[model samples]
Target: SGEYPTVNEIPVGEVRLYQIADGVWSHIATQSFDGAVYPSNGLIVRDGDELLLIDTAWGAKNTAALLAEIEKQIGLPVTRAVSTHFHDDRVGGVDVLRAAGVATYASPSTRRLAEAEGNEIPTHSLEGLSSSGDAVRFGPVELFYPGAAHSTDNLVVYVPSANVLYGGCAVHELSSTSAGNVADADLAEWPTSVERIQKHYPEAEVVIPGHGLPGGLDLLQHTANVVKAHKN
Candidate 1:
């Protein structure tokens, strides 16, 4: 067996760290709502002496478990983190990140939205970059805000070194027959947002969605098509 296998399973919330690249792992966190259990995915990237966390797990408890597991299994501590949005699925572990003394970052809008939504906010600022089409590198991942689709503050993370893109909840999994939640969605601009992602990262080979399995650039097209279908 390999020293670091592809899939590392944990007990909390059906959490699993699926390695998609040499030093990159997809973090999946499960949550229960309306009697159904849902899985939310993020990314964990290894950068030299430390690791970078993309999005927190489902909850504070689950996030704590994940941090501990990351240290125990990977033997590397997470020194920096970025929550893609203000949603609980994205920033649910803000507290854990703070407690662990990780340098947490999020967009200014995300910070405001988190406060408005009554969720824990990220500690640091993401520099309030130039609108939606801006690109800024934070630690190991390049953060891109392609306007708004899933939520007003949704962001996409791209790993330039690994050619992997973490689309958070903004991009839908191919297995997702329909857009899961639209209460805070912007259907009118959804397709455009996905197109921005498609244009920005043309070489993105591994695309990880917030839920379901990871695919290629096809996930971006699939997400756009799904939104179009929903609108029509």
Candidate 2:
């Protein structure tokens, strides 16, 4: 095919860059725990000469791989990153981001948890968050904490320009029959948290979960229902 094909597959972690719009992408980093392998996805926003990453890769090396591919494909370096939470998949590549002088926008909850959990500290912590649903604007992207679901500080991103919702791990992809991981989850609040995100971005055209293929708003609702069924 030609340049900017519909799918660009990277070797590491099977990281795939899926084009959502002219300037938006879904960066998925695959991970393995025990005998199970799953995708840990994030968002990528192309802003002129720079790129904004919603979440880093599953590891430092994977992070470097992700950036290299972006540079080769988009011709612009990723200068910023945001985390959905403090989990390994969300912030594992934080060291790489900091090494490259990348701006890391993190919520207070994420920073606190990362410190408590012995993860890499984020470079920047957003202030003045009214609560979980409070939206924070960073460059051309907007992130909001729809409340804790997958993790204690799970957050989601709304790409206004692209009209897409990055549901992080709080919402599972269509194929996820069970809530990804509940070791650090709030089962009682999980469904409500995802619902809050769904209500916040009712018309989000492309809803990308932390894993699996991107779908429409149903991905959000589907996660809620599946998680609830698991809870029951």
Candidate 3:
């Protein structure tokens, strides 16, 4: 009944849900990275009586609150989750979901990479990981992972029903389009990956980058072009 609490005020041991579209939402930590180069974003989609989560936030406190919020809003339990890549800030909260009995998914390579990175992910198993290609259907949502961009195993989620593309750090709009950062990027293969995503959903009207406001097709094209222009 009181004013809705901001994410920071949520208890450290809970999870919170933020709706991005009808039946589509994001589960985020109550807190964010200090001086984070880019804001972190995660996704959640309703699937019948079940919910599917994508990527965990950076810590337990925020992730716990995110889960609590999901329970409060969707009522349906989270049946599964997907990791976009093997980054700590993106997968650190996996333990929170695993403890809740939700199965976590990722590319086999991503799982191995996470395992090899050790502390990068405090929790989660490499067991349920799977290769992502074409469309991953969950109720009305269809997430398409054409290929990698920011990381070799990065996967972008597409909600065809909403015409929204969840471009993880792979195609961030706020990140600089300069060559200096290309060392960490797969310069040679990045354009092909972007093209694959674009070709898969040529009519996507809304594009949600990992950070920054959502935009339209032009933005998607711009993001791809920028990556291509900067590719070494």
Candidate 4:
């Protein structure tokens, strides 16, 4: 059954899939303006026998289905969950995976933020996902956190084997013609964070935003532009 009505509604039931590259797919939640209510986009990378999941989603309702879709599509067992940032919509669905005994990971900073905020930030489990340093590898996939952007604990997952970068909510796809939204954004340090991401992966061919369609180097430039525009 569909989760929500189609007309005049943000299709909460629909999940959009995009191939970042071979064996790397991004499952994005399609509804707009409902970040807290629906799943934020997530990433799945298949590295031989095991799969790496990035950002679980907003709530538990779609997580099981999302994992099922991953199983059907990627044909790999998820070995771990990596949260991109310290946001509820990004990591709230973690309990579903934890119940299945999947190890979840996030930057130590993310965990700290969650701890400080208490219920303010949505997270799967502080104990489940917390990692320090630039890289965390599972099978053939390696996740790295360049620095924080959207939040104080944001991390960019880079699959070196595939050369695909998951930008998370640190960057999104918004047109140059449109004015962006940044009520919760870190306007000052965001540019440096984008630069850090660019420096970290200069050769990345595909860039997956946490909320929109995947793009190329242009997305990085666009993100920089957005940060600059917002700063001014």
Against the hidden reference, what TM-scores do the models get?
A: 0.93, 0.91, 0.77, 0.80
RMSD of each: 2.9, 2.8, 4.7, 4.9
Which pairs of residues clash in candidate 2, taking residues 3 or more apart in a chain or in different chains?
Answer: none
Candidate 4 Cα lDDT to native: 0.66
lDDT of each: 0.85, 0.80, 0.65, 0.66
Model 3 accuracy (lDDT, Cα): 0.65
Q: What residue pairs clash in candidate 4, if any at all?
A: 88-122
Candidate 3: residue 141 lDDT (0-100): 61
Which candidate ranks first by lDDT, i.e. highest?
1
Query: How many clashes (backbone N, Cα, C below 3 Å) per candidate?
Result: 0, 0, 12, 1
Tens digits of per-residue lDDT for model 3, 63-149: 766677776777788888877777765677787778878777666667777888873342444332244355656546665665667
Which wins on TM-score, candidate 2 or candidate 4? 2
Pick the TM-score winner.
Answer: 1
lDDT of 2 by residue, 58-115 (tens): 8887788888878777778888898878888888889889998888878888989998
**Where is model 3 poorest over a 10-residue stretch in terms of lDDT?**
120-129
